[PDB]
Amino acid sequence: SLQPHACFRLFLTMEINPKVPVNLLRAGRIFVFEPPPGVKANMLRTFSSIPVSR
Amino acid sequence: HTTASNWLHLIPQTLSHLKRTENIKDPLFRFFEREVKMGAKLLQDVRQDLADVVQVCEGKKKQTNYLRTLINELVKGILPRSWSHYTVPAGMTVIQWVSDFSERIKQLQNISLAAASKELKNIHVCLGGLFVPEAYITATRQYVAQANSWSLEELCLEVNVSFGVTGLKLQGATCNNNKLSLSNAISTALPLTQLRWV
Amino acid sequence: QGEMALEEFLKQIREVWNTYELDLVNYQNKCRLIRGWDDLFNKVKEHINSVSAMKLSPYYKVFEEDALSWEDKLNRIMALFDVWIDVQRRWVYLEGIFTGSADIKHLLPVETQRFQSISTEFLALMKKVSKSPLVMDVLNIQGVQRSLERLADLLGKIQKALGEYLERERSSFPRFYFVGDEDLLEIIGNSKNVAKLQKHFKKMFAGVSSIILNEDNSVVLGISSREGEEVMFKTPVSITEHPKINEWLTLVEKEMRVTLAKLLAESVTEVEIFGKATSIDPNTYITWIDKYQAQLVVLSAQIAWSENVETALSSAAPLHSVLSNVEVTLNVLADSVLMEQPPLRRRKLEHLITELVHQRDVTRSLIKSKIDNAKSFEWLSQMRFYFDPKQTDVLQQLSIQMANAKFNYGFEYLGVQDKLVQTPLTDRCYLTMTQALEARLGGSPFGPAGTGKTESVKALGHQLGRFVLVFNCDETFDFQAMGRIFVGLCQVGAWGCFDEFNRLEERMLSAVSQQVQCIQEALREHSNPITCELLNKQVKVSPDMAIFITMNPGYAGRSNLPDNLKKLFRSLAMTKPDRQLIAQVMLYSQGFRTAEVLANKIVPFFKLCDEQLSSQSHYDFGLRALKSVLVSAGNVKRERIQKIKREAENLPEQEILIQSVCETMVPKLVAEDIPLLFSLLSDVFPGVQYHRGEMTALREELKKVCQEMYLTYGDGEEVGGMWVEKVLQLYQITQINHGLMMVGPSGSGKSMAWRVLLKALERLEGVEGVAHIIDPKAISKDHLYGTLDPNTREWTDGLFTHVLRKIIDSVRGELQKRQWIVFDGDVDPEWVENLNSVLDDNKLLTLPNGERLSLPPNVRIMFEVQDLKYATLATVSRCGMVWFSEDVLSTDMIFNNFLARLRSIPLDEASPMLQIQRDAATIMQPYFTSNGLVTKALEHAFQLEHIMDLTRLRCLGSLFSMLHQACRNVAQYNANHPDFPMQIEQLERYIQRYLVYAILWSLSGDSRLKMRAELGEYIRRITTVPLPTAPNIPIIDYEVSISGEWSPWQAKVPQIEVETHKVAAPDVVVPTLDTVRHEALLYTWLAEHKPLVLCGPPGSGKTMTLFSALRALPDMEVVGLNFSSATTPELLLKTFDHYCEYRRTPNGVVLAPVQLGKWLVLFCDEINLPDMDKYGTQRVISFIRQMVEHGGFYRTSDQTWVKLERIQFVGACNPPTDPGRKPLSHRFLRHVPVVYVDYPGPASLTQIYGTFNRAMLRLIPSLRTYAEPLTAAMVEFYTMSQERFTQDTQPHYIYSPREMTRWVRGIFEALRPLETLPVEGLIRIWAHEALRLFQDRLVEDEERRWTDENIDTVALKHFPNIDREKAMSRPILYSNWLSKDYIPVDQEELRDYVKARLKVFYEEELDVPLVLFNEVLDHVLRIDRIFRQPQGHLLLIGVSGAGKTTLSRFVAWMNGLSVYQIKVHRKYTGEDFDEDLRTVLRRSGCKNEKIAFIMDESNVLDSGFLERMNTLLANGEVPGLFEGDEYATLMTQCKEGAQKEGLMLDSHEELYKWFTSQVIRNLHVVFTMNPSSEGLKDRAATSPALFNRCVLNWFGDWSTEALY
Amino acid sequence: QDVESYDPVLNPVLNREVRRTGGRVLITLGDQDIDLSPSFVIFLSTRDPTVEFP
Ligand SMILES: Nc1ncnc2c1ncn2[C@@H]1O[C@H](COP(=O)(O)OP(=O)(O)OP(=O)(O)O)[C@@H](O)[C@H]1O
Ligand SMILES: Nc1ncnc2c1ncn2[C@@H]1O[C@H](COP(=O)(O)OP(=O)(O)O)[C@@H](O)[C@H]1O
Ligand SMILES: Nc1ncnc2c1ncn2[C@@H]1O[C@H](COP(=O)(O)OP(=O)(O)O)[C@@H](O)[C@H]1O
Ligand SMILES: Nc1ncnc2c1ncn2[C@@H]1O[C@H](COP(=O)(O)OP(=O)(O)O)[C@@H](O)[C@H]1O
Ligand SMILES: [Mg+2]
Ligand SMILES: [Mg+2]
Known part of the structure; x- marks a missing residue:
């Protein structure tokens, strides 16, 4: 029920729980964060997360 | 209810009874006595519950609330909380739990028969079928310690493939001349494990 | 001469009261207040005791008037002074704050003016009381009671x-939080x-328990700890400069730190000049220990060892020299501790030995491996201490260090505390938590209870010198409360050690994660006048700062930590x-x-004990038990050494440790584990042996108390040996322990055990012993512990909190007595986990x-429980168990207690009643000895089976009550002759x-007819008592006449014929x-005002029998109480409010009925229905058990013991095998006899x-020949309908003689104004009533057709030669609209009449068209038939949109009723529902108008709706609705x-x-609801009145006939 | 809109439980008597397909 600013993003962080409303699941865009598949992907995310200057 | 009555009729065909068998100072005698007593108590409550379910499912007897809970648990296939008194691996199913409990009752019957004829020292026990294998290990260590009049804290364990235990299974290894070799087999059964205290 | 002696005692009392004046001392040249209340209260209480002793015996009847006048004047002055001490105590500090504190009139002007007025009034009263110091003169002022009450209020x-x-x-002052x-x-x-x-420094500071002051109280010389250790400041702080309290308290807390720093410098200089030598002198070492405090001594030793090790590693010979010096020092310590020392110095020695053995182990590990440089991590890992005298700042001279974590000592005076054995696990914990603290992350160890988590955190804080706080948080710890304690810790600079953090309401856990993150960011900013935002304030x-977390993963299914809060804490597993x-x-x-x-012999002993012993819920062999055993071993070694010295030598250390193990662990064992544990002791320690007894004084005092209060005492092997040994074990555990439990089955004698022990300790030690008995489940957790108001930050004290606070304050001298707080309930981790920090x-x-x-040393918190199958290890471990087995208390001692109580203490309270009681006791003496007859009969009753679990003590107390009734009957016969x-x-x-x-x-009162006959047969076989010679008739069908022979009740029952006016x-x-047996037995119960339970199937006749029994007792008033699934003791409290009043007496408050001389009896109709908690308890049942056993309950308004004066209970219940029933507790069933109707x-x-049918068939004399076949057909149809329409098919398929009574009443009401009827018409009306009572509740067409077939075949079988076509038909409709009478009508004329009435109805009330069908x-x-009858309620089951409420509205309009609907909207809450109910009740009762209270299932929002509807439907009134x-x-x-009706009544009850x-x-209430598979069962469970007093009609969906 | 939180004040309107005061048309609503014009319609909206109605 609102029309917001252009550069406004609302971030909802939650655990995977059936109690989350289906209305909110349909309205929002869903991102799933999981342990990585594979040692290569694990090391890739570790190296991307650690800044280069460190 | 007809299928439930048939299943509960065929369940106690592997369950008959257990001898009650108790004045001995050795830990082995009293440990076996209390284990057989606990097994007999569990068997008699399970037998009473089975008889109640059979009579109220095929016959003339009303239904109580605890009986309704037991019947619902049996139909859903989950173990009732009252029956599960020992350790059940990661929430098993009643279908295999009745077989496991029947195996434990048969083992305890074998202990009772051996005790009816020290005499219990030469028997071989599978540690999976015992309610308290850690108590069995403590009891045999205490027995050898009292018999040899040694210390209770400076006793090591020598293992060969004066106490024999069965049912132990390896994981990713093979036993050959008491030497371990790495293998790709998921589980190799040990034929007989000998526990000698030095 | 005795009367003259009593008169001389009265004269002495008069003289000592006329010579006693209030002692007055000036208070800062302002007023002369009263001090010294202890002697006054002691004099008052001993005078009351003397008057009470004189009243009992021997010549009280001659001095009754003046004795009573002295008694009530003493009570009056006691009450006045009890109010006076409170008002003066409040006034002293109120005057202090309102005078010393400034900017109070500028901030609280109305409060300052109010206190000015109150102060003027109180100073006027002070001047009046100082004019005349005599106590009688003080009492002479009028209005002192109301004046003191107003002042206090x-x-x-x-x-x-x-x-x-x-x-x-x-x-201002940070520590005040x-x-x-x-x-x-x-x-x-x-x-x-x-x-x-001086009694608040314990809460304000760490170890500072008092402050040393001068003679003028102007300069603070020093501070002192709890154990007498004192620290004298180097530069004293002066209050004579007139600083404020916060200012000089800040000065004190700074001076304490600088004093500890200076003494640390001097002490480390002394240790430096000591440790340079290879040998040390024990004399100078002991003098140094006496010179310096415990923490300073330990710190100096650690500094010296760390400096020596660093200098050795700076450079292998110096490391060997350091280890040798450590070993020499430790040998000196051991030789010094082997002899006798003062306790404080000995504890300093103990801390030193612990620290030195840790240092020796560390040096051994460091020298075992090859270490050369001081930068190696093998040395860098261990905690080390650095002292720099060159630092000009005295606070930062000492620098505690570990692996890359520099620390500064807080220099907080910890007093002495208790040192911790530095295990390798403790070193690992130290390293991990100090790494977390360096990283500005709070620590968080976790694991099972008893691994040493909170004590490790506290030991780390004490090593760092930080002020540590342990909080036992629970679900009531709110976000605001955690913000408050965080801001307090931020102001003071302390550590937090929140214990059991996982039970903190996950939403609140997530919310407080933000505050924790803010604290972490603030500390990181400090690491580089900082501030952080807590509760929107900087x-x-x-x-x-350090926020530490202690928690057990999955201890009781507690809440789990969110990852957001988990990332802010460094975890540690320690098991x-x-x-x-x-x-x-x-x-x-x-x-x-x-x-x-x-x-090496005790730790494997505990490991073997944890396995070889049986598995019980109350066994704990963990580290807490091991430490308790070690401490008790040290104490008993000290006691034995002192006893020997009363006469160094050698002592049996093995035997001492065996005695400690036995004294700590023997009582918790079951009766089958004593030889097993003795075998374990003999195995581990061969020549162990043990000693017991040697308690002659306490044992003989216990015997005297047992003889006094009519108990059975044994000598150890006698009849009471097990019980007296258990009492002695309870005494030992109270002596050497902190919190206790008495775990055992109901009727084991634990209550009498601890009561007798308390009285014996009273009369032995001379200290007063007061016991507070609290039921923790009869009240809410909020009422038990406390409540924080969500709006304003105010605290309302709970029951246990109020009791403990009263003991702590000790305004009535409560600290000098012996207080035993007893929790007489059952343990579950909802409320017992709040006592984890208490029992620790x-x-x-x-x-x-x-x-x-804090908990004072004179208070022992004790538990009296039945089992610990729902208690957790965290609270089982902290207490000392005493196991009261069922065979500890044998039935022969109960028999002895009953015989003694019969022989003495006459019932009508020498006396003829006492003589008859003694005669009856000596007659029944042979039947109670050993086996006899009663024990064998009770064993057979146990071998039988009953509708409830038969404990021995229930039926045994019931038998005792029946024997008392026999004695009363003999007395009444003697009075009548x-x-x-x-x-x-x-x-x-x-x-x-x-x-x-x-x-x-008694034994067979709750069993079926065949089993009470079986018990009768067994008794007849087993007893030598004259019995009736009737082979067929059981003994239970006989009464004993007062002449002494057997008579049947078949002679008692007559063949009475009731009048036609009252047929049903x-x-x-x-x-x-x-019936006659049940009401005779009920009268036998009720004559002694004993509780009882009427168990049986619904409609069996339980309340009818109860009311028939109560109609023979004129001095009893019966009140109806209906219980549902959601029943709370608030209902009983509302009933007590409505029908009783709270009085005030000098011996406590009482609760008595408003109408004097009558015994109010409470009829709980569904005592079985209140819901059972997930830990297996019922609040209402626990409340009723508490007020039946202890004779009263607790008022939650002001935490006062309210004692029931004339209140008794009767209960009704379905058997526990019914679908909605949950079995009652054995601890409640102990008191109540139960009879199975x-x-x-x-x-x-x-x-x-x-x-009934013979009486009803008298209006028409030509029909009187059909009463017997009519009854035969009625009974056969009811019976054959009851067989298959059981509760398993549908929850409402219950059948009872209530339907038969309704059937007879309906036939009679149809037969009354009709005066002439053929047999065909009689069969027609009988069939119509049968259909209306047996077909309307059905669900399916197949069973409806089955009942139609049943009624047809029953009429055919029992009614031959009849016109079947004229009697039976399809419509069978009956109506009274067409005519004035209840004449059967055809379908078409009824349809035309209903069509015309609906035509009139369309323009009148509702203009909605309807279609008519059958x-x-x-x-x-x-619906009209139900609306005609009084109290006619309806329960319509059917799909939505079927027209149920429209038809109800139409019928209500046509019958003259008024239609009311509650008009639910958003936020329509319980108060709005109550307002609607009040309006409806006023319109229905006060205005005398018909109301058709239509209510739909959608109108239900909470369970309060159903509770009030249940009460209204069953009783016609709702107690607590109007107040x-x-x-x-x-x-x-x-x-x-x-007045409008014509009846002139007054008062309130009529x-x-x-x-x-x-x-x-x-x-009339019409309840419409949708059918459901489980909704109907849930509604039946949550409201039995909807299925008992509401007529059910299953409208259902429209049939195919209806649709066509 | 939002008939998920249905308010039971609309039950007499939806059921058309209407009185007849001569030529005038009278309905009840809460605690007041309301005259309704014959040209009155009401629509209830929903953005949630996966909603359950009693
Ligand atoms: N040593 C004794 N000798 C004789 N009678 C005893 C003895 N101890 C207890 N009794 C009797 O046993 C009765 C029940 O015992 P008690 O009141 O101590 O209950 P309890 O075991 O604490 O019960 P609960 O577990 O239900 O609280 C007492 O009323 C008393 O008459
Ligand atoms: N390293 C130790 N040295 C000496 N006593 C210890 C040690 N660890 C634990 N204890 C004792 O064992 C008991 C364990 O309590 P604890 O586990 O700290 O409570 P919680 O379970 O709340 O953490 C404590 O009373 C403590 O005195
Ligand atoms: N001996 C009897 N004489 C007359 N009526 C009886 C008798 N026994 C049962 N009734 C009938 O049974 C009903 C009693 O049921 P009630 O006591 O209310 O059961 P509950 O209290 O369990 O609801 C009464 O309506 C009564 O008419
Ligand atoms: N016999 C009937 N003929 C015509 N309409 C009917 C009939 N019974 C019910 N209705 C319709 O049902 C509506 C009444 O709903 P309601 O009485 O609330 O149903 P229920 O009582 O089953 O909840 C009326 O608007 C009416 O149009
Ligand atoms: Mg803790
Ligand atoms: Mg008791």
């Missing part, structure tokens, strides 16, 4: 209203007195502590030559306010048969054998309803309505009775 009001200034005052509101008020008020502050954060090392170090420190041998070694109770109430008294042989031959009758009706009236009971059966039912016609006739203003308005309206009659006659 207004002082409390201003005390509550002053709370806003408390936070502003707390912002841990001090409560009233305590802080005392601190501010008594600032100019100082000497009254606060300075000291750099010594296996080094018990071997702990035991070795503890024993070597306490002094034991074979320390290593004892440890912290000895302090934590509250959400941050106020931590004054000329010829009771012959002794007749009394013998009468009691010898009454005993058999009583044991029969509610109060009409036709007598039968079961069953269905009458066919043989009884035939005559019961044959009488089902609608049947529905409207059924106060609206109650008086209802009374005025009811009086006006009675007006309320008439109002209830008007409601029950003029109010």
